[PDB]
Design a protein around this ligand. Structure first.
Ligand SMILES: CC(=O)N[C@@H]1[C@@H](O)[C@H](O)[C@@H](CO)O[C@H]1O
Lengths: 41, 206, 264
């Protein structure tokens, strides 16, 4: 999960934040649609 | 396992690896790429020292990863610290070179623009504007009240499953004109459409 | 700080940002409830209990076709049947009794002092409620693809994405407790899904607020702006192309062109 600032616009920033959420948020445990943080990676 | 690595690379191609505790979603430690040193927050978990950057000489910092400690060490509040593209670049640089003067400020920038942005859409969108328009901003109460209440909001969301989406306690948030919005339920988009990750408190369900 | 909440006292706001009000603060069994301007009055305070009842003045909100017909009323929790005083609130703003599945809490008119009723659920903006103590409209920008803002165009009659300009009046929206998204500069005007189509999907425009099921929207945790209930649809930028000047109502797929942020 990398962020390069030379190759950086609004779109790549959002993609990066999107990936951080993917990796840290639970795939199965959600409440009202909002992910709970994972217990392990 | 527990710690999520994550890399940030500056315009000068200096990159650092930042470790995040998945339990709290807080930064615990980091290493500049190709360095013999690593730097740990004073309140990093024991397991951080045990498992991360054992390759390296592990230095312990003069402050912890709470916002109060960071503000204290930077000598200023989040309400006056500039965020944006150039601030982030400067911050990555200052972590990479381990500049003791600007460490706490640089952490405040990075934490807000990465971790707090990941937690809330409103913060993500504020940061995205700074990228697109190439224009820096200073957080006011809208951003700050989200940062400060994340744990509490997460708790109230879990608590709300027991009583029809109503909170056990009021959370005080602010809009962009610094007007107070007292939230006591999930039925506000500033909670339900905003909070993208929540801290675990209790074993509940919807 | 605990993950079980036993009882909570709050307000309920519905259509045209008005509140659920026990008529003239009456305490009698069968005292009817109406929509009324919001205030701190005890008869606008609603207490939700873990048993599933919703109460004001120490009595329970209730519906029974045999006893009250179509009308929603307060009645004694001891006297009334447990079926008739149990309630459910959904994220999409629907208040309903689990036993009377076809029905939903309604205000057939937008005007104040109107008797509240249990009508057939069409997921209409007259059947949309916010349970919570802050009753006011939430005002902000609505940000879509390419970090562009929804703008009210053509003298507040059409809607599409323009480059955000801070404090531009036409880019400010007011989100009401009924689930309507309204033009900030004219609160009689709602974001509405039209009969006009693009690629056989309804185009979204601005019409006069009429409390229909074309003007009720919910901001969901997936980042969509969606219609409440089943057979759900989402607001989307046609072909991910801002230059089309067309926002349409699409089957939900959670892609970028269906993602929005409330910038408040
Ligand atoms: C605004 C409204 O619907 N008011 C009616 C009222 O005109 C009627 O006469 C009364 C019976 O006394 O019941 C009320 O619900």
């Amino acid at each position: 999960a990398n962020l390069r600032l030379s190759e950086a616009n609004s779109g790549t920033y959002k993609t990066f934040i999107g990936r951080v959420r993917e990796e840290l948020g639970s795939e199965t445990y959600r409440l009202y649609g909002i992910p709970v943080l994972k217990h392990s990676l | 396992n527990r710690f999520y690595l994550l890399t940030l690379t500056s315009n000068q191609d200096e990159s650092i690896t930042l470790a995040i505790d998945v339990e709290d979603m807080v930064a615990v430690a980091y290493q500049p790429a190709g360095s013999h040193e690593s730097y740990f927050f004073l309140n990093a978990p024991q397991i951080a020292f045990h498992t991360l950057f054992t390759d390296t000489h592990q230095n312990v910092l003069n402050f912890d990863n709470t916002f109060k400690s960071l503000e204290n060490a930077a000598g200023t509040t989040r309400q006056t610290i500039v965020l944006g593209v150039d601030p982030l670049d400067f911050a990555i640089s200052n972590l990479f070179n381990a500049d003791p003067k600007l460490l706490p400020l640089s952490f405040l920038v990075i934490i807000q623009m990465v971790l707090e942005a990941s937690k809330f859409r409103f913060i993500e969108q504020s940061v995205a504007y700074s990228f697109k328009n190439e224009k820096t901003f200073l957080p006011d109460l809208a951003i700050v009240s989200l940062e400060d209440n994340w744990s509490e909001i997460s708790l109230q969301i879990q608590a709300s499953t027991s009583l029809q989406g109503l909170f056990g306690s009021v959370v005080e948030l602010y809009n962009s004109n610094n007007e107070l919005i007292e939230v006591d339920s999930i039925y506000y988009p500033i909670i339900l459409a905003n909070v993208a990750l929540q801290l675990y408190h209790c074993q509940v369900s919807t | 700080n605990e993950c079980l909440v036993e009882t909570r006292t709050t307000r309920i706001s519905g259509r045209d940002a008005l509140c659920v009000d026990v008529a003239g603060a009456l305490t009698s069994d069968g005292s009817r409830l109406i929509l009324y301007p919001c205030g701190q009055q005890v008869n606008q305070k609603w207490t939700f209990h873990s048993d599933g009842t919703v109460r004001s003045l120490g009595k329970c909100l209730a519906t029974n076709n045999s006893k009250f017909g179509n009308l929603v009323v307060i009645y004694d929790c001891s006297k009334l049947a447990a079926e008739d005083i149990s309630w459910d609130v959904s994220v999409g703003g629907t208040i309903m009794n689990p036993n009377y599945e076809d029905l939903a809490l309604t205000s057939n008119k937008a005007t104040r002092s109107t008797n509240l009723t249990m009508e057939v659920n069409t997921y209409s903006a007259s059947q949309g409620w916010r349970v919570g103590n802050y009753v006011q409209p939430i005002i902000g920008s609505i940000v879509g693809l390419d970090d562009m803002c929804l703008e009210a165009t053509d003298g507040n009659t059409n809607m599409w994405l323009e480059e955000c300009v801070p404090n531009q009046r036409e880019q400010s929206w007011a989100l009401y407790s009924d689930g309507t998204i309204r033009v900030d500069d004219n609160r009689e005007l709602c974001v509405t899904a039209s009969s006009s189509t693009y690629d056989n999907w309804k185009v979204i425009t601005i019409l006069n607020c009429d409390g229909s099921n074309n003007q009720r929207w919910v901001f969901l945790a997936d980042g969509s702006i969606s219609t409440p209930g089943n057979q759900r649809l989402a607001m989307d930028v046609a072909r991910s192309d801002v230059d089309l000047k067309k926002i349409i109502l699409h089957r939900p797929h959670g892609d970028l062109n269906q993602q929005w942020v409330l910038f408040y």
